[PDB]
Structures are given as structure tokens and as C-alpha cells.
Amino acid sequence: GSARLKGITLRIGVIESVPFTIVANVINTTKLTGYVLDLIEYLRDKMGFVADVQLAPPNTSYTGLVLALANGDYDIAIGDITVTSARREIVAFSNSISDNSMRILMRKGTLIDGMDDLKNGKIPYNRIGIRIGTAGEDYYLREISGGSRNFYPLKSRQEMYDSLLAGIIDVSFMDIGTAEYVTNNIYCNLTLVGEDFDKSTFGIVTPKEWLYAKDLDVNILSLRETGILDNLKKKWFQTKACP
Amino acid sequence: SARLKGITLRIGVIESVPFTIVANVIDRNTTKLTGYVLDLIEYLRDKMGFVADVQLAPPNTSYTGLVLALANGDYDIAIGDITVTSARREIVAFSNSISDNSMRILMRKGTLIDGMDDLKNGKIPYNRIGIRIGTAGEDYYLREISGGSRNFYPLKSRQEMYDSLLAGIIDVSFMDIGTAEYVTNNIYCNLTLVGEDFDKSTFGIVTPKEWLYAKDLDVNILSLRETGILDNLKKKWFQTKACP
Ligand SMILES: [Cl-]
Ligand SMILES: [Cl-]
Ligand SMILES: [Cl-]
Ligand SMILES: [Cl-]
Ligand SMILES: [Cl-]
Ligand SMILES: [Cl-]
Ligand SMILES: [Cl-]
Predict the structure, then answer these.
(1) Please, which domain of life does this record's source organism belong to (chain B) (predicted)?
(2) Angle CA(A226)–CA(A227)–CA(A230) in degrees, nearest 5?
């Protein structure tokens, strides 16, 4: 069976990541903005659901968000969430809302040329920072360390930046969109190096065998076709403050 | 959901070098299929254990036609350079993407066109824009160039597209980027591409709506992506250049 989402309330999980989902404290409440919030409003306007937007707790990992949805804590989850085989085993994903890949993030002046330097042991493993519960962790375990968790574990993007800037780690991995955004707008002393890797996609997380899958997919595809997803990307990502 | 091990799947494919390459060989005539799609079927079969009954769509079948044939029950899945679109998703489901995609303008070498702007500003009369009917290119033309008017030069296949360009009947057409590069680097050295990419999209395997095996297929495609098989296959079939 299938159905339309018109009139239905959806608990929509989101997770902090600038400029996908920007969390501001104002006065005394929090206010969400970004590409994800705008996307929700386009979808809401076309499909007629009621959006109950729920921010994942601090330090919730990407894997944690998916597992929370699988356990029924949300109806869908929307963000910079990579479609992976292990995740697809427990949840479904909408049609892609964006292409993706990763890049290596480091401090300027660090003598790293690209991924070969990581795979050839030029960097001690405990100086490669990896955010646990991310696709970057899967890649590392599959391609660098042959299964051993010998990376420096990171609980969040903020820990990743702080650890790089304090010299506790030498490199980490980020999705290309946000990697470009933060090194161009926030952390002028950090930079990207090497070719991009792990080509992938972002998708909206839904329950397996979801009643509303077609309605959501058809609307996501229409937003692509008519150039709304591009406009949104341009609105939130085309910007550079760093000199 | 459950497993397809031992289950026969009727797999629709559609000729498109080097995704699906059709050769006719003689003694009595027989047909041989090779290409990216055939290798992908092998990889999926090895992992998933289904039995593959590969069925080539009749000549001049359109992409939309293939999708409709599947919706009608003629195939269990269909695999090829098939663009995921909103209109198609109304009637079938699509697996996770097997490849990103976009389109380019195809034209004869030397033609004085700099890009999509010249198709809108009337430098090319509509009847000299060739558009393969039942393709995503048609949808884009209608959406972005002609305001819904089917005023183009209709084409029934890539062959007709190439023939028409080379005979000077049309000045431009649209092609997916992967095959556009392949064909202009290996087959038609006097055709070329121009202008920016457009219509960023994906290719997916076509399945029935609400298919019981959707998870099983998706997990396996993602695994091929993650372990680099899809990249290897792309390199194998597409990283070739015969034209000088
Ligand atoms: Cl590299
Ligand atoms: Cl990231
Ligand atoms: Cl599912
Ligand atoms: Cl252009
Ligand atoms: Cl094409
Ligand atoms: Cl030629
Ligand atoms: Cl469906």
C-alpha cells in the first residue's frame, strides 16, 4: 500500500551541521535555520504534512540518528546523512538529495599530499582523528586500518576542529560540502588536501517499507528537476568570508 | 523481504554502447550482449545468488517505454543508463543510484554554438533541435526550452540522432555525459560536445513499486559502490579513446 502525506504529522529528526542545520540560541529559545530547514518548508508546502522538527541531542552521531529513527524516535530524518550499505540494512532512504564525497582536512603547513600518505603510514594512526558513527569511520576501517579502531576518536565536528588546531591530531575526514564551507568561512587556518574519495549520496532516512515512500521520492525528484535543490545549495553554500 | 538466491529474474536491458553492446554474429544468426551492464549483472548475481534471464528490449524501445514495460510486468527489474525522474517514480521504484549523471549538447564539429543559450535565443530553429522521444532529454527540453511545446525534431533512437546530425538535418541534440564522451571519443570523431553540463541526475535500476526485494538489491549496490567495483567497471568500459 501507498498513501499521501497530506495532513500527516511527521517527527523530523535533524542534526547540527552548518549550513545544513544551524542552531542559534536567542532570547530564551533556540532557532533552527539552513538548507535543511528550507528544504523541509518546500516539501511541507508541496506535500501538506505538519512538520514536527526535532533536533538530535548534542554529540548524537550520524549512525545514532539513523538508529534512533529505526527505533521509532522519529518518522524521517533529514540532513547531510550518507547512504551506506550498513544503514540501508536497517532503514530506507529517499531518492538522493545530493551527491557527496569526502576530503582530507588538516592545518595549513602540515606536510600531507593526500590519501596515500595515510595508507602508507606517514601519519601515526592515533593522529588521524575520526568522528565515530560516521561514514568517514567506515571508510577508515575498510581502507586504512583493516578493521582496527586505532584512530583518535572524535565525538563531534567541534572536537575535530579543536583537535586539529591544538595539534592533537594531524588530519581528519569531512564531506566535501561542509569541508569547503568551514575552511572557507570559519577556520581560515585549516585547509583541504588530496583528491576527494568515497563518492556517495545524501538521502532522507525513512522507515523500511514506508507507506509514504513514493510521495516523498516524487517530490524530491521534482525539486531537483525544477532547480530548487541547486538554488538552495547556492543560497547556503556559495559564500567565503576567509581572506 | 528475504533472499533471491535461486530465484529467476527477468532483467530488461536496452542497447547503449558501452552499457549494453549488442553484436550479431553469423555461421544462422545469434546475438551476443556485453558491456558495463552485463558485468554489473554478473557481480550482483554472484553476491545475491539469483538466476539472470537477460532480455534485450526490442529495437527503438524508448527509455520511458522500457520503464512502462516493466510497470506492465514484462520484466522483474531493468538495468541500464536509465535516468531517475519524478514522472517515472510515479509508476516504478528505483534502486539506490548506480551512477551520477548529467547531460551535454551534442553537435557536429565546427558548429558555431557556445551552449544552451543558443537553443533558447532562436539561433537554432526548433525543428533543427533533435530530441529523442521518451527520454529525460525530452522532459528537459519541454521544461526549459519550449514551454511545453513539442516543436522539436523527434528522434526514435541514438542511431537516428547521429545520422540526422551527420546528414545536416538537425544541428544539436542532448546526450547523457558518460555515453556522450564515449561516442565522441570512440565512434563519431566529427561530432563533439559543447556548453555546460545540465540536468544533474542519477541512474538507477528500475524495480516494481513496493518491491519485496528492494532492500536486498539496495544493500548490494551500495556494497559494490563502497568496495570500488562500480568505479572499476566505469574505468573498464569508459576510459577508452580511439579518436585522434
Ligand atoms: Cl589523494
Ligand atoms: Cl563532514
Ligand atoms: Cl526497505
Ligand atoms: Cl551552456
Ligand atoms: Cl544518451
Ligand atoms: Cl563522425
Ligand atoms: Cl513505491
Answers:
(1) Eukaryota
(2) 160
Q: Can A1-99+204-243 and A100-203 be said to share one CATH topology?
A: yes
Experimental method: X-ray
**Angle (nearest 5°) at CA A98 between A93 and A99:** 105
State the smallest CA–CA distance between residue B203 and chain A in angstroms: 11
Contact B85 A1 (CB under 8 A): no
Cell, residue B108: 557536429
Q: What angle do CA A4, A8, A9 make, to 5 degrees?
A: 145
In this complex, the residue of A83, A95, A230 whose CB is nearest that of residue B222 is: A83
The grid coordinates of residue B57 equal 528490449
Contact by Cβ (8 Å): A240, A185:
yes
The answer to whether A18 touches A178, Cβ cutoff 8 Å, is yes
C-alpha cell at B111: 558548429
Residue B5 in grid coordinates: 538466491
The verdict on whether omega for the bond into residue B208 sits within 30 degrees of 0, i.e. cis, is no
- CA distance between the termini of chain B: 51
| CATH top class, domain A100-203 | alpha beta
Q: What's B101-204's CATH class?
A: alpha beta
Contacts of A146 (CB under 8 A, 6+ apart): none
Which CATH number is associated with domain B1-100+205-244?
3.40.190.10
Measure the CA–CA gap between B147 and B9, rounded to whole angstroms: 40
Q: How far is it between the farthest Cα atoms of chain B?
A: 57
User: Chain A partners of B202 at a C-beta cutoff of 8 Å?
Assistant: 95-96, 201
Give me the resolution in angstroms, 1 decimal.
Answer: 1.9
Which grid coordinates are listed for B126? 526548433
In angstroms, the CA A226 to CA A230 distance is: 9
